[PDB]
Amino acid sequence: PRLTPWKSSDEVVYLKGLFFPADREQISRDELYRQYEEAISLVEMYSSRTRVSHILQSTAHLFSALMMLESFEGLDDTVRLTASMTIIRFVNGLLDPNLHLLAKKIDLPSLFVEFRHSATHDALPSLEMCKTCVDRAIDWVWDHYWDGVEESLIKELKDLFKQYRRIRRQNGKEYWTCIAGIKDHADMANFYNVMIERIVSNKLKWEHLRALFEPMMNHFIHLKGWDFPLGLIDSMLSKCAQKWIRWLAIEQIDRYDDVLVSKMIDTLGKTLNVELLEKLQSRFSADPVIKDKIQAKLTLIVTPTLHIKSFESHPNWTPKPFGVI
Amino acid sequence: HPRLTPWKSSDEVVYLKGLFFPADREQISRDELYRQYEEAISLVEMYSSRTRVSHILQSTAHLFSALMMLESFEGGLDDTVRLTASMTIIRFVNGLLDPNQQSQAKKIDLPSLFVEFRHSATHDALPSLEMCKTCVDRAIDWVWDHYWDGVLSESLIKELKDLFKQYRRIRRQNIPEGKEYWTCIAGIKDHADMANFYNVMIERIVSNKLKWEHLRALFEPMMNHFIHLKGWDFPLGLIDSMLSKNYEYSQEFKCAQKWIRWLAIEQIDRYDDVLVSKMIDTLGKTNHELNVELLEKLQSRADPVIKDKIQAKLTLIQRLSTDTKSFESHPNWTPKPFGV
Amino acid sequence: SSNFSFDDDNTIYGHDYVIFGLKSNQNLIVKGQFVLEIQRGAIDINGVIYHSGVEPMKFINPSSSSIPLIQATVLNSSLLENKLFTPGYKSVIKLTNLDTHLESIGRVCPLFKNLFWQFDLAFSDYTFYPITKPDNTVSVIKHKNWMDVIKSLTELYSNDQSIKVIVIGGKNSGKSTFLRLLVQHMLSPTLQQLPINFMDLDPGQPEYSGTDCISLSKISEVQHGNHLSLTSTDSTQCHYVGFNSPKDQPTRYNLLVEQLVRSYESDGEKHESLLINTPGWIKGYGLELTRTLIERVKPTHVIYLNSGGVDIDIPKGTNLIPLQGSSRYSSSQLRLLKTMAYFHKIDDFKFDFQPLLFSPPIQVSYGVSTGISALTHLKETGIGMDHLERSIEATIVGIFKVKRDHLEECLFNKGQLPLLPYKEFIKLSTEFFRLALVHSIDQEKKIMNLYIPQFRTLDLTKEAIIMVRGNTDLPIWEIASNEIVKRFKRQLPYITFEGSSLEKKW
Amino acid sequence: SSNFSFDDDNTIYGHDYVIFGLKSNQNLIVKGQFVLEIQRGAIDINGVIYHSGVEPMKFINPSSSSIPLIQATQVLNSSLLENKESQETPGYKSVIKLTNLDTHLESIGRVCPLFKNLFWQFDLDQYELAFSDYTFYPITKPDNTVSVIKHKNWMDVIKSLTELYSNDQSIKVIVIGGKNSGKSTFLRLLVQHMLSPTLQQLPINFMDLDPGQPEYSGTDCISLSKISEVQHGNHLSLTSTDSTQCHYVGFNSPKDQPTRYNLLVEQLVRSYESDGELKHESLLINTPGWIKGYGLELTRTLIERVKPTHVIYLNSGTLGVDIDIKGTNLIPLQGSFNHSGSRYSSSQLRLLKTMAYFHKIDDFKFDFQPLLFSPPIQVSYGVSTGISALTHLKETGIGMDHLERSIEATIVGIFKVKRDHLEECFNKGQLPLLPYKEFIKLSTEFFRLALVHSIDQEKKIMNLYIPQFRTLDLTKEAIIMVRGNTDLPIWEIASNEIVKRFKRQLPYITFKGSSLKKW
C-alpha cells in the first residue's frame, strides 16, 4: 500500500495533459508555458507533500529549464548553468541505483553521458547544445515513463434501501438502525444520487411516494454534512423527477438555513428552465441581501455568509478515509 | 617563456581586483555594487573571448553572477535559483580539485563545506536556498584570500659613449684605414636604434665644454653622414627631441640651437610638408619664446602652402604666449606589438 | 551470547508483578516495559546503583536498543530502607507489570509488534520477560572509559556549580546512547539533586523530542528505559525545525538555536547546569554548525566519539572516545514511530493504538477568525496559492502560537486559505503548541479537519492560529493499516496498489 | 629503426637536385620536402605504380607525419612510362630523381626552436663523407623516423574500393574515426589511389567536415574541394588543392555552433549533391573526431543525410549498434604512430597550421619572418563599405563598448555579404556588432581569416594583417567579421625575433609562474 502524493490517482494523467499538450500543435507558444507552470508548481507541490519519483520530478525541472532556453534571447552563463545542472542532476539521478556497459542497459543516450561529464569537468556547454540536450532528454522520459502511463456493493446498498421501503410500508428499534446504516453506504460513494434514481422507482403515487420517501429526506438533513441534501439536487439538475424538485423546493424552505439557502443559489443554477428558478426565486421572495444577490444570478442566465470553525470535536462522525471531508 | 595575457598590459586584472571587490564593502550601494559587479564579469567573458582565462578568474566571474542570482530574489519558485548557484558551486570545486592526479585531502585548503555541497547537489537532494546562499559567500570569500588579495599593483650607454667618443678621435684625424672610419660611423648609426639615444645626443654636445664651431664641424660630416646613411628620418627624431629637449630646457642652452640653425638651414630643402608640420606642431607645443622665434625662422625660409601654416600657427603661439580608407597597406610603417 | 542470571524457586511467580530474590553473583536481563521498586538491597545498573529507599522507576527498554542490566553487583547506608517471606540472597528486586499499551504497535504494523512485551522453563506472560537462556538480543555494556567519562564529570557535579557539556557524533555514532547514559549518573540521588538542564538540537535523531524538533528540556527524574521521548520530561519549548536535518533551514535553524540557549543562559548560570546534543552531522557544514555552537556556548567541556577534530580543536577542551555504537530493524525507520507515537498517547505511558480515523476529530476554520488564521510554507514558498490548500491535506502539519498584534503582521490571499509568506513568518516570535495531522479540509465551509494527539483545547484571546508545513513525512500505517483497509473497502484517496518504466524515488 | 636501400647508387650530386638510380630491391624513405620526376623505370609509392611518363609530384612529408616509402618494386610494367636520360640506361632497374622543393617551409625554426628539424635543413660533428645539404634527403642509416605502410586490408580495402571506380560506378564514401585514429593518414591514402594515373582523372570530390584536426582545411573550416592533383606528403592544408569553398565553423570542435554546424554542413551537401550526383567524381568524406556523444550522433545524422556509398569505421564500438549495417566497413584503429615530441600535440600541431596560413606567399613558398614588419591592410570602422560589422560567434553577450577591445590581437574571419543582405536587422558608434541571431540567417561566403593588429579606437580604421588575396573588391558586399574560438599562435604575436626587437612589456603578454589555477 504505497503512498501517493496526488490524492486521487487521477491527477497524474492530468499531469500528463499539461506537460504534454498532445494537441501540441497548433497552440500558442505561451500556452505551452502557462500550462507548464501549473504542472511545474504541482510537481513542486506534489513533491512538497512527499517524495516523488525521480523520473517524474526531473520532468518538472526539464520542462521549466527548457522554459529557460526559449524565453532567452546577452550573458548566457547563467542559462548554460540551469539547463546543464538540471541535465547533469537528471542524469546523475537516473543512474544511481548502484560504466560503458551501464549506460547501454540504462539506455540513456551517450550524449546524455557526455554532457554531465563536460559540464562537470569543463567549459559550460553552449546553450545551443543544451537545447539539443534538454529537449533530447525530455523526449526520453516520454519514451519510457510517460508514454506507457463494485457490483456486489451496489446490490447490497439497493437491498438495504429496498428493505427500507418495506419497513415504512407497514407503517426506537434495531430496525431503525437499518436505515442509519444505509445512509453511510451512500455517503461513501459518489453514487449516492444513484439511489435517487432508485427512490423514484419505488414511487407509485404523490405524497404517498413522498410519505414513505419523506421521513428519510428530513433525517439525512438533520445530521450535519447535509450538503448532499443540496447535493442530490445537483443530480436533479439532469431533470416525475420535476415533482420531487418542487417538493425539494418546498422542503428546502423548511430547511431554513443559510447553507440550505446556499444550496438554492447553487440549486437555482442547476434547475435553463424558468419555472425552477422562479419557484426558487419565488420562495426566496427577494428580501435578503442574498435575496438581492440571487436575482443577480437569475439575471445572468457568490458567498452568502460567513462559515465559522473551531477546535470542537465533530459531534457525529463516521470513519472517512482521509478523504471526503 | 612568454604567455598570452587576455588583458592588454596585464594591468586590468589588477583593476578587476577593484571591480570584483570594491574597496569599501558597505558604504557603496548594492544596486550600484551590483552595477559594479556587472562590469567586472563582462570583461572576463570578453577575456575568455580573447583567450582562455585562469579557472580561478573564470569561476570568480561565475561566483559573482551567482551571488546576485541568490541575493536579488523576489520569492516564488526556487527551482531555478538553486540550479544556477548549484552548478556554479559544483563547477568551481571541480576545477580546483581536478588538476589532481592522485589521493583526492584539502591540502589546497578548500573548506569542508564545499565537498559537502557538491554531493548534495551532485547526487543528493538539491541544496536549499539558504544553503547555496550561505555557501557561495563562503565560496566567494575563499578566492579572495587564496588568489585575489595577492594580485596587487647598461649596454646602450657604452655604445653611445663609445660610439660617439671614437668619432672624436676621428674628428681629430681630419686634415683599410678608410674602412674602419666608415664602419665606426656606420656602427654608431646602426647602433642608434634606441628610443633612449636622442636624450644621449643633447648630453654629448654639452660634454664638449670647450669646442669652437669647428669642433661641431668635425661632427657635421658625421651628422650629415647620419642624415646621409639613413636619410631624412634622422633629423626628424633629432629635432623632435631637441625641441622636446629644448622645451624641457626652457652654451648648452645656446650651443644646440646654433646647431639647430645648422640643422635648420640645410634640411628645409629636403623637407616634405607633413614633417615640417610635425615640427610646427611640436614647435607650437612649447609655450617658450624660443620656438616662437624658430617659427619666424622657418617662415622666412617661396612655397605658399607652407607659408600659411607657419604663420597660422605663429600668431597663435604669439597669442598664447602673450596670454601671460580601406584595404590598403600602411603608408609609413614601423613595426609594433599588437599594441598601438 | 548474552544471558541473565536465572533464579528458580527463589524466583517467585507473583501476580501482576514479579519479585525475585537475587544472589549476589547474579544478573537480571529484562525486555519490555516494567515499573520497579526494590525490596531489599542496592542495585547498580549501568554503573548506577539504586538503594531500597528510592521510589519505583519506569523503564521502557525496547528490543532494538541495548538493554540496561540490573546488577546486584552492594551495601548502601540507609537512607535507603529496603523492603517478603525469605531473606534469601543479598538483594531483593521488585518488578511490577506496567500497563502502557505500548506493544500495541503490533495492531497497526505487522513487523513492528515484536519490539515490546507481549508474547509472540515455565513463564507467566506479562509486559516484562527476563531472558534466562543467553540469547541474541543485546545486553548493555560500555568501555569503562565510556562509563568513566560521563562518570568523571559527576564528582564535579556534586561540587558547585554548573558544568556546560557537549557531545558530537555520527548519526550512527551511538552518542544518543551516550547522552542518556550521562543523564542517569548525575541525577542519581547519590548526588546533587538539582535538575540537570537539557538541550536536544538534533532533529534527525532527537531525544526528548517528537520528530523534527529541537528542545530545551529540564530533566528532573531518571528515564531508565529507552524512552523515545514518549514520556514527558518538563521542557520550556519544543521548537519546529520543520526538517529532518539542519540543512533545510540553516538560517532558521541557527537563528532558532541561539533563541533557545538564551532561556538556557537564563538558567544556564540557576543552579542546574546545562546539557546539549549536536546534529549527528560532523562532516562539512554541521561541523561549522558544531564549531559555531562551541563558541557561543562557552561550554565547559565537549566530547567527540571519533577522529577524522581540528576545527573542533579550538578553543574548547575536548575528549576523544571509542566508536561504541550498537534490529531497528533500520534506525532510520524508527523515526516514524517516534512521530506516530505522538498522536496515540492519551498521556505518558498510556497509548491507544486504534487507528486515528475512528475518533471524533477537531475542526477549526481557516479564516481571519481566531481558531485558525493562516498557514505558511517552510522550504518552498512558491506553491501556487490555489494549490496550497490541497498541499496541507494528507500531511502532518504543525499548529503554532503567535501574539495577536504581531499576528496581524502584514495571510496573503484571503479567499480559501490565507497564505502567509515565509519571509514575514521567520521574523515574528513564535511559540509552538502541538503537532497535528489533518484528516481533510473542507473547501465548502473553509473549516478544516485535523487530529491532534492531546490538548487542553488551546483557549486564548486573539492569539491567531498558526500553521506550518515542514518536511516531516507521514507514517503509512495510519492511512493504510490492514485494519483500515478491511473496514474500508480498498480504494486510495491518496494510496495505491503495487509497475512502469521507470519511476521510483531517486 | 626502419632503413632504406643506401647508396652507393652512382649518384651525381648535381647541384639543385639529386638523381637516384635504383636496383630493383631498394626503396627509399626520404626525409624532407622535395619534388620528383622519374627518368626511367616504374617507381611505386605506397602501393601505387607510377611510370616515367607521369608528371612530377610535390612532397611535404614531415617528421611529424609518417614517411611515404618510395619503392622501386614495380618492374617496368607498361609502355606508358617514358624515360629521359642524359646520364650513364645501364640495364639496372629504374632511374629516378626529384629536385629540391624550395618551399622555404623549413624556417619553422626562427619562430619556434620546437619546430626546428620538422623539415631537414641540417638540424655536431659530421660522421659521413659525401654528406651534402639540401631541402630533401634519405635516412639511409636507420633511426626511429616513421615509415608508412598499412595492412594490406588498409591498403587493400581502399585499394579494394578503387577497382570499382574504373567501372562506371561512383562511390560516395564516408569515414569515421577518433582523432589519432589515422583517418587523416587514411583519407590521404585513398585519394592518392583513386587519382592515380591509371584511373581517368575525374577530379575526386573530397569533403572535410573536421574543424579540430582538418585535412585540406584552414583551422576551424569546412570545405569540399574537387581534388584534381595528388598531395603526395602530409601538406598541412599547405597546398593549392583547388576546391570550391571553406566555411568558417569558428571552433576547434563541432559543438561550438551545433545549430550553426549542422546547418552549415547540409548546405555544403547541396553543392556536393549538385555535383556529387554527377558521379564524374565520386563524393568522398571526412567525418569529425567525435564517435560517442553527439559526434556519433551527428555522424549517424550525417550517415543518413547523405548516401554512404561506402561507410568505414576504424575501431569496434557501441557505434556499431547505433548505425545500421547501409553496408559498412570495419578496419583496425591503425592510429598514426610517433612520439609526441616527434609527433607534436594535435592541439600543438594546429598552431603550425593556424600559423602557416598567414605566412604563405604562394602554395610552395613560405616566409616565416614575423608579420609585424609587413604593412597592415588598414580598414574602415563604422558603416563604411570596406568592412561593415563584427558579429560574435558564440559569446554574443558582451558590453557594446568593450567589444572593440576584444577584436584586437585575435584571429577573426573575413566574410562576404551582398547589398542589403548585410542590412538585414548596432552602434556606429565604435562598431557595427551585427548579432549572431541576424548572422545565422544571412547567407554568407567566407574569406580567409584575418589577424587583427592595432585596431584604432581614435579613427575607425584598424590595421589588419592577412594572407594572400586578390584585392577584396566587391561592389556592395562588406567584410562582415566574426571572432570565434580559434586561438592565436604564440610566435607571431611573440616569437624569439620579436622579443628581440623590443624586449618590451607584452601588449598582452607576461614573462616564471608556479602553483596558484587553469582548469
Author numbering:
A (entry chain D): 5 to 77, 79 to 103, 112 to 162, 176 to 197, 211 to 278, 303 to 334, 338 to 367, 398 to 421
B (entry chain C): 4 to 107, 116 to 164, 177 to 198, 209 to 283, 299 to 349, 352 to 374, 405 to 420
C (entry chain B): 60 to 132, 134 to 143, 151 to 187, 203 to 351, 353 to 391, 394 to 411, 417 to 500, 502 to 589, ...
D (entry chain A): 60 to 147, 153 to 187, 198 to 399, 401 to 500, 503 to 588, 590 to 594, 596 to 598
What is written in the article reporting this PDB entry?
Cleavage assay indicates that ScGrc3 can activate ScLas1 nuclease well for ITS2 cleavage, while CjGrc3 exhibits relatively weak activation ability for CjLas1 nuclease. To better understand the differences in the mechanisms of Grc3 activation of Las1 between different species, we also solved the cryo-EM and crystal structures of full-length CjLas1-Grc3 complex at 3.39 Å and 3.39 Å resolution, respectively. Since the crystal structures have similar quality and resolve more structural information than the cryo-EM structures, the subsequent presentations and descriptions are based more on the crystal structures. Structural superposition shows that the conformations of all Grc3 domains and Las1 HEPN domains are almost identical in the two complexes, while the conformations of Las1 CC domains are significantly different. We compared the HEPN domain dimer structures in CjLas1 and CjLas1-Grc3 complex by superposition and observed that significant conformational changes occur in HEPN domains upon Grc3 binding. In the Grc3-free Las1 structure, the catalytic residues Arg129, His130, and His134 within one HEPN domain are far from the catalytic residues in the other HEPN domain, while in the Grc3-bound structure, the catalytic residues within two HEPN domains are close to each other. Notably, compared with CjGrc3-bound CjLas1, ScGrc3-bound ScLas1 has a more compact catalytic pocket, which may explain why ScLas1 shows better ITS2 cleavage activity than CjLas1 in the presence of Grc3. In addition, His130 in the ScLas1-Grc3 complex active site and the analogous His130 in the CjLas1-Grc3 complex active site adopt two different conformations, which are similar to the conformations of His142 of CtGrc3-bound CtLas1 in two different active states. This observation may also provide a structural rationale for the activation of ScLas1 and CtLas1 by Grc3, as well as for the fairly weak activation of CjLas1 by CjGrc3.
